[PDB]
Design a binder for this molecule. Structure first.
Ligand SMILES: *SCCNC(=O)CCNC(=O)[C@H](O)C(C)(C)COP(=O)(O)OP(=O)(O)OC[C@H]1O[C@@H](n2cnc3c(N)ncnc32)[C@H](O)[C@@H]1OP(=O)(O)O
Lengths: 342, 342
């Protein structure tokens, strides 16, 4: 999709303090071989206090993003809140709380689930909503927020390719103006790969209690065994290449003209990484940042973009690729152009 | 929102067998006074078999609805799966499963959370998406699915105003054509009421285990206390009346020209009921049906419209009000004109 009139108005993260892989190793929580392989130096870890519940961190990130963009909350016509895990209270609309605390009473709010790709997928859904004429305001607030805790989640081991960081991020879209223009978005998807996110886990009538520690790495292997697909790895590669090619093509931009790519925090640690598929070096991705925060739920792309802008690592005229990807498997990519610095 | 080119192509519900309130009374699960007051005659109840997990019930409803509209799955550009509760397997994209099984590999799929309003809210989000140019296809598949189970959920008592039913529904939208035309949608919202859905439940770092039985009636009472607003009931009434008024006038339709209203399954039992606020009699709403299914997660409106169409209880030219409402609080309403009978 080529967007004629869509902008990023503001972007911000609220992240708790850093917790080092070195301390995790010394506490016996993380095998040193694994620490070295995955290359994550630290992840962000929140206290267990109510004030650090995901919807409260999201509310803080949202207020920072709206303030930095100078967007009036009364001009926000939609709130989308994406997440991976528990928001702190069940049977309750976390999205309406985020909306209420950051924007106000009379804005439609949805919770959005597209696993790790939620932040990026939200941009397409919101962009469409803003162009439709359904609501009066010109802006949409997109938030993410998670806070991982045991027993269910072991942030250091529960996923093979990454380590979870706690925190929230926010991005404000506008059809009027912003510091960056969204030139394009594009989604590659292959829903056959959903089996890798459940493995051989049975469908249970109720959440299994007490919660065993999650092991999504073992799910992918039971999943691969079960699927019996000849081209499993090719399916992943193809959907990622389609998102990239179409986002770039619809933006009229080549990969050589991408100043920086903001990517999911994940790492194989040997062989080809995502940057090799994208066709650009490691230093032109957000990895140097991402490896200090870990995988902050659905917010890596918003957080990484905030990092670029806050540290003046881009200037007007640069184009940036925001690149998604999440279990499903769904990948939404976007090309943005820096128009001015906040 | 007046819609120039939005149609309903097919609608279906996959419902498990009914279970009577009176059998529940005799089993010591429901107080006789409550069964009489609420007037719910029966509720749908799924088996605990894996084949009745919500996303699987949703896939079958989706297949049924896609067949009734003769929609080629290659023309579906979006799947939105809305739900209230656990989908059977955690940390997994249920929407991608629904999409894969009902439509295919290469359609973007999102999970949606807007409590009981998810089904109706999804119509606006999907309408915008189809109108935007993002996907080539002309149709969106919208599903719902839930299957309630203990200890967390007591279908008979966990919500004071209704009793939960298991099952799934599906609604296929199209910008090209269908058996019904969507003339309008309108959302009223007041996010201050999110507190009623949370009560004084503290934000916990991890799901509380073992799960106690949910009591959402008590959350409302505790929430109202904490909120201490003098006009709480007026806020609720006002957003419902605003949803109603705007839907009706964007469709250029007066209330006495609405043949039927499909409403959420609930009942106070004395005093006014929603039909008084809508300004139409009880027999021109879906209550006679709804009172046999219970509140079927986010799918009451889809199911109620399916019941109308399948039993030829509406004819070409009739206009139907579909009326949402979910904790948040958000209410999305729509006026639909029947163009022909499938
Ligand atoms: S996922 C969906 C979950 N469900 C919800 O989120 C429901 C949210 N709302 C509530 O829980 C509130 O408690 C509401 C419904 C706002 C208030 O309910 P009450 O029944 O406690 O309201 P009051 O007793 O204050 O009623 C006073 C008078 O207000 C009118 N009125 C209230 N509710 C309705 C409805 N549903 N329909 C028509 N009129 C309504 C009545 O005139 C009422 O006087 P009565 O003499 O009781 O009729």
């Amino acid at each position: 999709m080529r967007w004629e009139n869509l902008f990023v108005s503001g972007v911000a993260a609220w992240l708790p303090p850093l917790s080092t892989a070195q301390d995790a190793v010394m506490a016996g929580l993380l095998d040193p071989a694994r620490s070295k392989l995955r290359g994550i130096e630290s992840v962000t870890v929140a206290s267990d206090a109510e004030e650090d519940a995901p919807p409260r961190m999201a509310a803080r990130a949202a207020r920072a993003a709206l303030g930095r963009g100078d967007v009036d909350p009364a001009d926000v016509s939609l709130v989308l809140h994406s997440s991976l895990w528990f928001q702190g209270i069940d049977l309750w609309p976390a999205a309406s709380y985020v909306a209420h605390e950051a924007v106000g009473r009379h804005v439609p709010a949805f919770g959005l689930a597209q696993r790790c790709n939620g932040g990026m997928g939200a941009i397409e859904l919101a962009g469409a909503y803003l162009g439709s004429g359904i609501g009066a305001g010109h802006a949409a607030l997109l938030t993410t927020g998670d806070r991982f805790a045991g027993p269910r989640i072991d942030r250091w081991n529960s996923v093979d390719v990454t380590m979870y960081g706690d925190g929230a991020a926010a991005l404000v879209l506008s059809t009027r103006d912003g510091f960056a223009r969204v030139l394009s978005t594009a989604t590659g998807v292959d829903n056959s790969l959903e089996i890798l996110a459940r493995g051989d886990e049975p469908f249970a009538p109720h959440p299994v209690e007490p919660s065993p520690v999650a092991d999504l790495g073992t799910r992918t292997v039971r999943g691969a065994e079960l699927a019996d697909l000849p081209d499993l790895t090719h399916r992943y590669i193809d959907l990622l290449v389609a998102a990239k090619t179409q986002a770039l093509e619809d933006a009229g931009t080549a990969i050589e003209d991408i100043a920086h790519a903001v990517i999911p925090v994940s790492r194989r640690g040997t062989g080809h990484e995502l940057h090799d598929l994208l066709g650009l070096p490691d230093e032109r991705t957000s990895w140097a940042y991402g490896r200090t925060t870990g995988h902050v739920g659905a917010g890596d792309q918003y957080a990484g973009l905030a990092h670029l802008v806050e540290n003046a690592l881009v200037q007007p005229g640069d184009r940036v690729l925001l690149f998604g990807g999440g279990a499903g498997y769904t990948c939404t990519a976007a090309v943005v152009e820096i128009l001015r610095m906040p």
